[PDB]
C-alpha cells in the first residue's frame, strides 16, 4: 500500500549474548531520539533484531534545523541570501532527519552514529522506498531503453542529488559513446587497421566529451541549487582522534590528529603500490611468455593462442576485488577528518589499482615487448625446459585488445543470464516489507563509476587497436543500463539523499585518461603501422600538442553555449535586482559660496566666455 | 596647501572657432551635473579652456548611488550580503563620483562621456592629487629602495586597486627575481655554459613564481574585498551600435552588434600578423646575414661582430611602438561592448606583437639557423656581390643574448641619465596647480606590465644562454623601481580608482611564457652542449613533463600555505555564523497512537525483549 508517515528506520540488531547492555543502549537511543523531537515506534524485527521507526514530531525543532542548514549553505555560497528570521523538497526532509539522527548534540540533533558512538548494536539507519512509486517506475521502465531529463529529475526528487548525478553522467556517457561506435565501425570497415585518422577522431571525441560533461555538471549544479556543496566540510564519524585543541584564529573545538602520523600512514602506499606492480607484472610476463611458447609450439594458431590472456582477463575481477578490499582497509587505517577527503583518497587508490590491473597487460603488449624483447627470455627458457621433461608482431596488441574486451564483456553477460536458467493482523504487510528491506545491501555507486571510467579509458587509449571495441562497450552499457535501473528499485535499499556538486575526483581521472589516450593512441599507431625513434617522439609531440590545442578550443567554444542553468541564474539575478531596487527606491567654506544655483552658474559662465573670447 | 573639498575636475577645452555650441554644451553639462546633486564651480582655465570643479552636494543621491553599487557587488558575489535598507574608503568616493559623472541617466548619474556624448569639448575628467600626501611620500621615498606591504596598502587607499595590484606584482617580481640572479651568477661562475642544472632551476623558479603570484593575487583580492570584480561587466562608452533589441529571457535593453561584423573585423588580425611576421623576419634574416658576412670579412672579430644585432635592438623600441599603435587602432576599429573584453583583446594583441619583436631574433639564432642553414645563403651572395663592387657556431646565441639584453638595458639607463645633464589673489596657487595638473599625461600601466612580462619571458626561455642576464634585469628593475614611484607622484595625473580582481590576461601570458621557457631552455641546452634529433625530442619530453609535474606539485603545496586572506575570510564567516545563530536562537493515524511518550515506549520495548528472548 503506502507508508504510514515513516521517515527513517533503525535496525538495531539485538543478540541474546549481550542482552543487558543492548537493552541499556536501546533505552539510551530512545531517550536521545525523544529529546530532539522525533516520534518513535518500536516494532517486532526479524533475525534477532528490534527495528524502530522514527519521524519528525515537533515542527519547531525541525524548523530550527532547516534554518541552520540553509544558513550553512548560504555561508558557503550554495544559495543567495539568508533564509529568514522565522519550501522543503521530498528528498530533503530525509536529509535533515538523517542529519539530526547522526549529528552530535552541539548542533541540535543527537549523535546516534552506528560506529563512533557506544551503540555497537546500531548498524543500519535507512529511509523507506515508496512502494507506489517503485511499482509505477518498474511498470513505466519495463518497456523503455534510454534515459531523458525527466528521469533524471525524478531520480533527483526521489533519491537525492548524488544518485541523480550518477544517472545523468551515465546517460551522457551512453549518448556520447554512440559516436565512438560509428567511428569505430567505419574505421574497421573502411580505414583498415591502426588508422591515424581514427586516433585523431577518438582524441577529439574524448576531449569533447570531457569538456561537455564538465559544462553539463556545472549546469546541473547551478540548476539543482547544489553549486558549491563540496565546499561544505562534513565530519567523518569514524575519524579517530587523540587531541582536542582550539584554532589560534577562530576557536574551533577541533579533534586534531598529528599530521606526521597521517603522512607516515600514507607513506605505506609506496611499498603497497610497488609490491602490486611487481607481482602483477611478473604474472603478466609469465602469461605472455607462456602464450608465446604455446603459439610457437601449436589447429590452434589463432584461436588457441590467447588462452593465457583469456584466463588473465577472467581472473582480473577477483584480483581487482582483492586489491580494492586491501585499499579500503588501508584507507580505513589511514585516518581522515572529513568525509570528502576520505572519499577522494579512496577513489584515488581504487582508480590507481584498477588502472593497473586493467591496463598494464595492454601496456606491456604494446610498448614494453617491442624495445624490451629479452625480458621474457628467461621465462621462455623455463617454459622450454619444462616442456622438455622469436619475432614480435606489433599487431598482436590488436587481437589481444579484442580478447581483452569481448571475452570479459561476454562473461559478464553470461553471469547475469545464468541465474534465471501476531503483528496486530492489520498492517503486517508493511512490517514484513520493512523486514526484507533492512536485509538489502547498501546502494554503492563507486563501483559503477569506476567501471565506466575504465571503459572510457579503454576507448581512449586502446580502441585504436580494435575500433569495434567501443561498439561492444555500448551494447554492454545498454544491458548494464537495465541492470542499474532495477538496482536502486528493489535490488538495493534507499540511499541517504546526499547533496553533491559533481562526480568528484572521477573528473580528474577522466582528464588524465584523456591525456594518456591522446599519447597512447598515437604511439600505438606509429609502432604498429611501421623503426625510427625520432618519428615516435615527433608523433607524441604532435598528438599531445594537438590534444592541448583541441582542449583549449573546445573549452573556448563551450564557454559560449548558453546553458539553461546559467540563463536561469541570470534571470533570478534580474528578478532579485528589481525586487531590491523597488523595495528601496576658512576659504574652504566660501570657495563654494560665490555662486550657488542654476542661473548664477549660467551667468558667471557667460561672463567667463565673454572675458575669455573678448581679448 | 590642501584641496578645498574638490573631488573631480573637468577640463572642457573651449576654442574660439566653435564658441556657440561650446557654450551650449557647457550649459548642458552644468545642468546635467546639477540635476544629479553635484556642486559645481567654474573657474579660469589656461590654453583656451574652462576647468570646472565638481563634488558631491546632496547626501541622498550619493547614498542611493553607493547602495546601488554595493547591491551590484553583492549580486556578483563581491561582498557577503545586502548592504541595508537605509563605511566609505577614501579611494571609493572618487569611484562612485566618477560613476555618476559618466554613467547614463537610467542608473542615477548623467552620462558626460567625453567621446560617446555630443560633448566633443570634454576630453579629460580627473581627480586631484593630495599635495600633502604627495610631499610626504616623496620625502619618505627619497631614501628608500624596496617596497613593503605598508606601501602597497597606502597605494590601495590612495589610488584604487589597479595601481595597488600593479605595485604588488612589481614588488613580488622584484623579490622573486633575486633567486634568478644568484643562480645565474653561480652558473656563470661555476657551472660553465649551457648548464642543464641551470635550466632546470630556472624552470622550477618560473613555475614557483607563477603559482605563488596566482596565490598572492587571490589572497589580495580576498583581503581587499575585490574578489569577483571581473564578473562585473562595465559598458564601454566608445562602443558603437546599430540595433537596439531585448533579451529573449530577461528583457535587457541591449545595444546589440552583429557578431558576424565583429568576426570579420577580427579576421583582419591574420593578414596583419602574417605581414608583420614576414617583414620582421626578412629584416632579421638580412641583419643576421650581414653580421655573418662582416664577421667572415673582419681587430673586430668579437666586438665588431654583432653591430647589426645591436642596431636591431636599438631600433626595436621604435618598431614596437609603431606596431602597438597599429594594434591599438585595430582594436579601436574592432568594436567591443564591454571594457574588460576590449582590454583583454588589446593586451593579447600587444603581447603577441611584443613577443614577436623581442623574441623572433633569438628564436632564429637558436632554432632556425641550425637546421635551415641555407635560408640566408641568397642574402650572403647578395652581400658578397655588393662588396665586390660558412659554419654556424651554436654558442653565437649566448653572446647574442648578451647583446640583446645589456645594450638595450644600458640604452634605457643612458636616456634617463641624459636629460639632467586676477584669480581673486587668495587661492591662485591651487588654481595654477590644477592648471599644470590637467596638462599631465594619463597614468598608463599596461606598458610596464608588458615590459615586465617580456623580462620574465627573457629570463624564462633565454637566460640559460647567458645566466648573468637576469642579474642585469634586476639592477634595471631597481632603477626602474624609482622611475615608477615618482611616475604616479608628479609625473602623471591621478588615475581613476578602478577595482580589479587580478592583473588580467597577463597571468595567461606568464603561464604561456613559462611553458615555452621550459621547452626552450632544454632545447637550447641540447643544441649548444653538443647531433641526433631523437635526443632533442627526448629532452623536450623530459622538460615539458617535468614542468607539468612541478606545476602540479607546486599547486598542491601552495594549496596548503594558509594565506592571511583565507583565514580572515573564514574568521569573518565564523563571526557572521555566530551572529545569525544568536539572532535567531485511516490506520495512517492510529499507527502512531498505540504508544506515545517515554515510559510507554520503554515498557513496550521491555515487553518486546521479553517475548523475543523468551522463546
Ligand atoms: C602513490 C602515492 C603515494 C604518496 C605518498 C605521499 C603521501 C602525501 O603525503 O601526500 C598526500 C597526497 O599527495 C599526493 O597525492 C602526491 C603524491 C605523488 C606521488 C609520488 C597528501 O594528501 P592530503 O590529504 O594531505 O591532500
Ligand atoms: C598509474 C598512475 C596513475 C596516477 C593517477 C593520477 C590521477 C588519479 C585520478 C585523480 C584522483 O584520483 O583524485 C585526485 C588525486 O590527486 C591527484 O591527481 C594527484 C596524483 C595522485 C597519484 C599519485 C584529486 O582530485 P580532486 O578533485 O580532489 O582535485
Ligand atoms: C602513465 C603514468 C604516469 C604517472 C604520472 C602521473 C602524474 C599525476 C597526474 C595527475 C593528474 O592529476 O591530473 C591531470 C593530469 O593531466 C596532465 O596534465 C598530464 C600532466 C602530468 C603527466 C606528467 C607525467 C590534469 O588534470 P587537470 O589539471 O586538467 O584538472
Ligand atoms: C610520456 C613520456 C614518453 C616517453 C617515450 C619514451 C621514448 C624513448 C625513446 C628510446 C629511443 C631508443 O633508444 O630506442 C630506439 C627504439 O626504441 C623505442 O622505440 C622506444 C619505444 C618505447 C615506447 C614508449 C611509448 C609509451 C608512451 C606512453 C632504438 O634506438 P634509436 O632508434 O633511438 O637509435
Ligand atoms: C591571431 C588570432 C586571429 C584570430 C581570428 C579569429 C577571431 C575569432 O573569431 O575568435 C576570437 C578569439 O578567438 C581566439 O582567440 C582563437 C584564435 C586562434 C588563432 C588561430 C573570439 O574572441 P571573443 O571576443 O568572441 O571571445
Ligand atoms: C607567438 C604566438 C603567441 C600566442 C600567445 C597566446 C597567449 C596570449 C596571452 C594570453 C592573452 O593575451 O589573453 C588570453 C587570450 O586568449 C588566448 O590565450 C587564446 C590564444 C590567442 C592567441 C592566438 C585571454 O586570457 P583570459 O584571462 O581572458 O582567460
Ligand atoms: C611558440 C608559439 C606557439 C603558438 C601556439 C599558441 C597556442 C595558444 C596558447 C594560449 C595559452 O593560452 O594558455 C596557456 C598555454 O600553455 C599551454 O598549456 C601550452 C599548450 C598550448 C601550446 C600548443 C602549441 C595555458 O594557460 P592555462 O590554461 O594554464 O591558464
Ligand atoms: C614544440 C614543438 C617542438 C617541435 C620540435 C621540432 C623537431 C623536428 C625534428 C626534425 C628532425 C630532422 O629531420 O632534422 C634533424 C636535425 O634537425 C633538428 O635538429 C631540428 C631542430 C629544430 C629546433 C626546434 C626546437 C624549437 C622548440 C621550440 C636531422 O635529421 P635526423 O637527425 O632526424 O635524421
From TrEMBL, chains A, B:
MF-aspect GO terms: chloride channel activity; identical protein binding; metal ion binding
Record-annotated Anoctamin transmembrane domain positions: 155-572
A Pfam family that the UniProt record links to this protein: Anoctamin
Protein name: Plasma membrane channel protein
One annotated Gene Ontology cellular component of this protein: membrane
Record PANTHER family: ANOCTAMIN
Subcellular compartments: Membrane
Origin species: Fusarium vanettenii (strain ATCC MYA-4622 / CBS 123669 / FGSC 9596 / NRRL 45880 / 77-13-4) (Fusarium solani subsp. pisi)
Annotated Ca(2+) 1 binding sites: 412, 416, 451, 480
Protein's UniProt keywords contain Transcription regulation: no
Binding residue positions for Ca(2+) 3: 416, 448, 480
UniProt keyword annotations, A-Z: Calcium, Membrane, Metal-binding, Transmembrane, Transmembrane helix
Amino acid at each position: 500500500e503506502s507508508n504510514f508517515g515513516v521517515d527513517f528506520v533503525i535496525h538495531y540488531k539485538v543478540p541474546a549474548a549481550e542482552r543487558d547492555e543492548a537493552e541499556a543502549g536501546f533505552v539510551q537511543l530512545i531517550r536521545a531520539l525523544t529529546t530532539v523531537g522525533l516520534a518513535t515506534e518500536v516494532r517486532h524485527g526479524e533475525n534477532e533484531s528490534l527495528l524502530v521507526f522514527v519521524k519528525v514530531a515537533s515542527p519547531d525543532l525541525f524548523a530550527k534545523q532547516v534554518y541552520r542548514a540553509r544558513l550553512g549553505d548560504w555561508l558557503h555560497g550554495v544559495r543567495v541570501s539568508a533564509p529568514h528570521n522565522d519550501p522543503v523538497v521530498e528528498a530533503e526532509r530525509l536529509r535533515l532527519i538523517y542529519l539530526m539522527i547522526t549529528k552530535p548534540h552541539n548542533e541540535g540533533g543527537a549523535g546516534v552514529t552506528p560506529t563512533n558512538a557506544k551503540w555497537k548494536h546500531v548498524e543500519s539507519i535507512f529511509p523507506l522506498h515508496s512502494h507506489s512509486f517503485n511499482k509505477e517506475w518498474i511498470k513505466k521502465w519495463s518497456s523503455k531503453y534510454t534515459l531523458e531529463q525527466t528521469d533524471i529529475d525524478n531520480i533527483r526528487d526521489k533519491f537525492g542529488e548524488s544518485v541523480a548525478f550518477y544517472f545523468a553522467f551515465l546517460r551522457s556517457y551512453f549518448r556520447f559513446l554512440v559516436i565512438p561506435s560509428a567511428f569505430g565501425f567505419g574505421a574497421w570497415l573502411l580505414l583498415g587497421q591502426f588508422s591515424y585518422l581514427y586516433a585523431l577522431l577518438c582524441g577529439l571525441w574524448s576531449v569533447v566529451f570531457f569538456e561537455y560533461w564538465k559544462k553539463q555538471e556545472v549546469d546541473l549544479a547551478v540548476q539543482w541549487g547544489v553549486r558549491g556543496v563540496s565546499s561544505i566540510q562534513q565530519s567523518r564519524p569514524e575519524f579517530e582522534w587523540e587531541h582536542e585543541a582550539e584554532d589560534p584564529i577562530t576557536g574551533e573545538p577541533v579533534k586534531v590528529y598529528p599530521p606526521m602520523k597521517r603522512v607516515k600512514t600514507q607513506l605505506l602506499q609506496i611499498p603497497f603500490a610497488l609490491a602490486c606492480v611487481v607481482a602483477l607484472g611478473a604474472l603478466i610476463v609469465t602469461c605472455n611468455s607462456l602464450e608465446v611458447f604455446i603459439n610457437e609450439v601449436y589447429p590452434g594458431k589463432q584461436y588457441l593462442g590467447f588462452l593465457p590472456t583469456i584466463f588473465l582477463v577472467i581472473g582480473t575481477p577477483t584480483i581487482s576485488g582483492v586489491l580494492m578490499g586491501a585499499a579500503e582497509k588501508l584507507n580505513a587505517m589511514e585516518n581522515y577528518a572529513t568525509v570528502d577527503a576520505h572519499d577522494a583518497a579512496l577513489i584515488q587508490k581504487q582508480f590507481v589499482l584498477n588502472f593497473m590491473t586493467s591496463y598494464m597487460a595492454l601496456f606491456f603488449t604494446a610498448f614494453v615487448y617491442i624495445p624490451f624483447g629479452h625480458i621474457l627470455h628467461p621465462f621462455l627458457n623455463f617454459w622450454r625446459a619444462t616442456a622438455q621433461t622469436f619475432q614480435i608482431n606489433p599487431a598482436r596488441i590488436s587481437n589481444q585488445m579484442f580478447y581483452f574486451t569481448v571475452t570479459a564483456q561476454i562473461v559478464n553477460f553470461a553471469t547475469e543470464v545464468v541465474v534465471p536458467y501476531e503483528d496486530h493482523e492489520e498492517e503486517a504487510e508493511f512490517l514484513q516489507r520493512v523486514r526484507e528491506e533492512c536485509t538489502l545491501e547498501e546502494y554503492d555507486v563507486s563501483g559503477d563509476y569506476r567501471e565506466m571510467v575504465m571503459q572510457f579509458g579503454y576507448v581512449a587509449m586502446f580502441s585504436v587497436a580494435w575500433p569495434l571495441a567501443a561498439c561492444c562497450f555500448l551494447v554492454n552499457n545498454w544491458v548494464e543500463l537495465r541492470s542499474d535501473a532495477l538496482k536502486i528499485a528493489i535490488s538495493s535499499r534507499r540511499p541517504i539523499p546526499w547533496r553533491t556538486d559533481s562526480i568528484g575526483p572521477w573528473l580528474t581521472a577522466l582528464s588524465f585518461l584523456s591525456w594518456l589516450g591522446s599519447i597512447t593512441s598515437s604511439a600505438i599507431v606509429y609502432l604498429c603501422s611501421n623503426l625510427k625513434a625520432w618519428g615516435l617522439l615527433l608523433s607524441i609531440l604532435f598528438a599531445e600538442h594537438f590534444y592541448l590545442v583541441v582542449q583549449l578550443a573546445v573549452r573556448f567554444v563551450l564557454s559560449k553555449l548558453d546553458s539553461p542553468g546559467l540563463q536561469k541564474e541570470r534571470k533570478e539575478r534580474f528578478q532579485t535586482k528589481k525586487r531590491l531596487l523597488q523595495e528601496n527606491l576658512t576659504p574652504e567654506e566660501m570657495f563654494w559660496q560665490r555662486q550657488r544655483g542654476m542661473q548664477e552658474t549660467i551667468e558667471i559662465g557667460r561672463r567667463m566666455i565673454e572675458q575669455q573670447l573678448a581679448a
